[PDB]
Symmetry: C3
Subunit: 451 residues, 3 copies
Amino acid sequence: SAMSVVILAAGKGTRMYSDLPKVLHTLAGKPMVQHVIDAANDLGACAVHLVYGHGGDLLRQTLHEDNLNWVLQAEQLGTGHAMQQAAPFFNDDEDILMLYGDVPLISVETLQRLRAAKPQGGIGLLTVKLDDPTGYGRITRENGQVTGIVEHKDASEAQRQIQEINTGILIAGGADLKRWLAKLTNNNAQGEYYITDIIAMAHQEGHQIVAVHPQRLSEVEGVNNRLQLARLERVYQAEQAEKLLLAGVMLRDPARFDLRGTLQHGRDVEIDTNVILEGNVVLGDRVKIGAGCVIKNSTIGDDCEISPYSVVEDAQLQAACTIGPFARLRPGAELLEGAHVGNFVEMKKARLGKGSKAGHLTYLGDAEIGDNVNIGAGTITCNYDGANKHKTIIGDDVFVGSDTQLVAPVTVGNGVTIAAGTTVTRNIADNELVLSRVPQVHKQGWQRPVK
Amino acid sequence: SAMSVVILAAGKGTRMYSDLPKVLHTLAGKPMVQHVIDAANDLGACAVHLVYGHGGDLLRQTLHEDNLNWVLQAEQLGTGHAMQQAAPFFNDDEDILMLYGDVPLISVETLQRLRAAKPQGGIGLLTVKLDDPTGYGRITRENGQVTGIVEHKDASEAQRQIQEINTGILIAGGADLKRWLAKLTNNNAQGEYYITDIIAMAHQEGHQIVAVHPQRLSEVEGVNNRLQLARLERVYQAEQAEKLLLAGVMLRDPARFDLRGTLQHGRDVEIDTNVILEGNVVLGDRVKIGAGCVIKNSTIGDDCEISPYSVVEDAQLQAACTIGPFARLRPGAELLEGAHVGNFVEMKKARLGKGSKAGHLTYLGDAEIGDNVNIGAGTITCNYDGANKHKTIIGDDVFVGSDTQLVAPVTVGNGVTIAAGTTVTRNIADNELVLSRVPQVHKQGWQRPVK
Amino acid sequence: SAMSVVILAAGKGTRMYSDLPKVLHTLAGKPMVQHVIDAANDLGACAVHLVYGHGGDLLRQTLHEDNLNWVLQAEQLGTGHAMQQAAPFFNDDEDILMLYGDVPLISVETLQRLRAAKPQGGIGLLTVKLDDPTGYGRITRENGQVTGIVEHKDASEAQRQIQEINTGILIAGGADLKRWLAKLTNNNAQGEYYITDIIAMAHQEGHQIVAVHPQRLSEVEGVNNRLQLARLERVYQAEQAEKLLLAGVMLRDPARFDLRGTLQHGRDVEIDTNVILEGNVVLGDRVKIGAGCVIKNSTIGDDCEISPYSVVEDAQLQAACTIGPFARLRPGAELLEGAHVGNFVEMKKARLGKGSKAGHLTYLGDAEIGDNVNIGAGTITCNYDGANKHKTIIGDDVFVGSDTQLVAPVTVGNGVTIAAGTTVTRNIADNELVLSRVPQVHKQGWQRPVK
Ligand SMILES: [Cl-]
Ligand SMILES: [Cl-]
Ligand SMILES: [Cl-]
């Protein structure tokens, strides 16, 4: 049946020493709470109730889902209190899954299992067996069945021997939750309303608590400081790297590899050390990526070789292109089949034609360059006049001599040969050798300066 | 006496998800099977019998040894069957060592010990003691002596307690192997011919099986997927890094260091984080290599400093040169004693003289540059006319002003001073200040464009 | 009361295979012995007695403290002998703390605790409990109190069960040390004078030995080869990275982060993988540093973004500057608020004004550039005439067209527009569009060369 999610994002997060709300800090390039939001929507949540206490301006600036429902916890009185704020929105006939904005790696797979295990009228509980369960609340079981949670402060010498502890994540019916939440009190040392009281309520009423466990302990790890965040980052990258390796991408060093987004890949891709893939990256068959590349939101066709230390953002390479080492492709970079870009070359909103080469020390901006063109070393498209951008068009089979300047808007015909060092301001018709040059003069007797 | 090797390379390798035969995937820049081939030749194998079942085109394209003998296993019926295919080539009077194309790190040292331990008429067996020997066949021993291998499926509760397991690697006489292999049958669940049946044969005939162990467990690790390959890569690099550190190379971070080939080094070399050394690299005394360099098939003389993010392939630096940061030396790059190459500079088939400097934003291709030359920033040798490469020659003690173009073929004399921005097409005689320049004109009243 | 330190630096260090004295090899960019020297001065040592046996030229070249006292150990006869050489300099009324030039990570905190625990007339001893104390001398205790050190060679079956071992570091009164050191003998297998004999002396005289332990085992780790040095490097960097993370700097991968010096940082700094910080680095609030940057002795104001693979040494960025990717800032680089430096750009002794941009392929050396200037792509300040450096001055609101050359000394007025490809040699007055250009000529019928 229908189901909605409450994401708790209400801690102060002081141990982050941050002006950014804690659950907005990123993991693999996406905010922690966004991981949870995405899981809930993958589960098909009808609504996502985000309960926050601070930083509502910044949260609302960053999170936009058509089904996101914002719920202020006006005071920090505990997770049970936080649920009481969302409770007026639960439907009686829907399940309500409770999640944490700072436990980002919880998986859809685990949550689907939790949801299946919730007994009617009862509670599904996500528990984990720890080697050292000190501090955590222990799950009590009599003749196989769960009966309650005992906090560590109140556990007996023999109770503190249970290794199964409560993760805080749970699922239950909307109408039942409304019933339990209303009965919550706060007579205790901290004066808080603890959500775990509802376990005892359900048990005393005659209903069942069924527990399931995550596949990986990392799925239920929480983040309160940046050391915990960085450790979770490494765990997640490691898991991604293993999946890629097993699926048939060769990562030379999986510990020196980062994916912050998504990867579609062909067969026989090889990725060298210290590559960062960001956004949505698409790699064809037999793409080779060299040491140190950063590739963001780009598509790289079959058989391309990206040499070391290239930076690619929002670019398109067709099959069999070679870029780098030290190539810088910016949004709108576009290489046709078999094109080459060398070292210290920058492209921005620029198309390099089929089999065309710009091998050295070149800036191509706002340009359409034809097929079988040789952009000589030191060439620059002057696309900026101080106020507006202008376009440079080069035809098919053009030789642009080393250190040429094209002052856009300029069109260059097919078969043109532009001489070295020359400055191009007006158009050039087909097959015109064009040049703008002064012959060298030889001065006799010049004495070179001295200190 | 003489000895030959069988390398088994006959698995399907499906779990690699590859169009490249599995044993051709590289480890430290060399195909796995090539590691094994090299060990066998270091051992002095008279012949290397490579038994394959698939991918013979690609194997024969990649492997070339004058003593390599290709043996098709026409069907995948087990390692015992694979040996029966090589068996018609064994000489009676030679030992036959059996190796695996996907167990690349087996060492010459271990194999020499195995060979010494083979009893006459008997079998030398390579066994390893595992913390968890589950699945592997256990070595049985009575009063010290080996008597058989018990597969894990057929081991008793107490048998599964042996931690010594069969690695599959073994050595025995040619004529004995021919005798045993012929007696192999395939009445079993898998219908295969298992090479380990010959252990029981030798024992029942009255001959001995003597076992030895590898030094490191990694020596007998096999690769069936790219996760196993990547883990073996890290293990191997780590071992190489330790040897280099103990021999007196300072690696700032041995976990961020890769050698894919060989290194000869002097005293007091320092290598910073994330350096990749490929091919045959030779480093003099007191070479300093900065963060991120990639150096392939190059020789770097005493006291050179390679600053961060330089890429060097097939280059020669004499003593006391400085290149980088962001230097790109390509094949034929050649620096004489005390020469300097700065940032965003590229050399290809180019010699920079004794104490000569090209510090910024320069391409030198197909050039011989004299001693005490200052290649100004932005200089470019135009060596390519669209069809053929041409040569630029600069003499001793030449000042090439910033942003000069040399249109090869051009010779420049000694003591020449070339002015900034000038274009050089014809030769220049000694001490000629040469220039090609238009005086700047000052326009009054120009209004700069607007959006 | 007063206190002085003896640093033992007298080993041969042969296992380093080095021409540099062992204690001078660096850890986090500072010589090992300098770590110890700095701890001793933090403790307020009145004198630091450095006892060496070899390499005195190189030591004295590298170490300079106004309170450093050089003490030759003329022969390698043991640490007790080494102390006898420093002993003539101890004052009766001061404590003498004994340290080791090759145990670099010993902390001021631990040493302050050791100093507090020295009983009057007695010895403070630094001991550590090891999981495997094999080889080390065991601390003996009767009814809580220390009584002696038993070397491992002379320990009983039950003695070798003590896990508390002597680290060699100790503190005692000057006059007592002079008394004990004089009574040292060398009747033993090695013929050496062992400093640990003084423990028995103090005990037999009726005085106490009180022991304390380091916080971390790494604090008392010694370096005899470069593998041990590299492992200590990683341990130290890891500890620094944790402190930074907990203090609120986001390191994307703390294992790929190196600080060789000091860091002052604001709130919400983010540092990506493979960044090296050297010397004294100051980062403002919300600085973002990209993958691979190296930043040395520089100050980077609030909100700057340093894109990947930039190298910064002795630079100053004001608030809100953007440099990189592939930026190279050299000493004297100076960016005012909101300035931008793009890819393949180099600055040296150069100031880029408020909101000024040099985005591509540019060298700015010895230049003062005004506010709201656009340095076009390919621009070069020719500051070097072969003998002396010269200065280029550009005013406010100047458009320097792509591939311009400024031949210093040149002043450029405000509002100047310099055309593309032009060469500037004489000054330019305000609002002068300046240009130096030849119109392009179009040759008919030119046949391009062929192989
Ligand atoms: Cl590479
Ligand atoms: Cl460095
Ligand atoms: Cl990045």
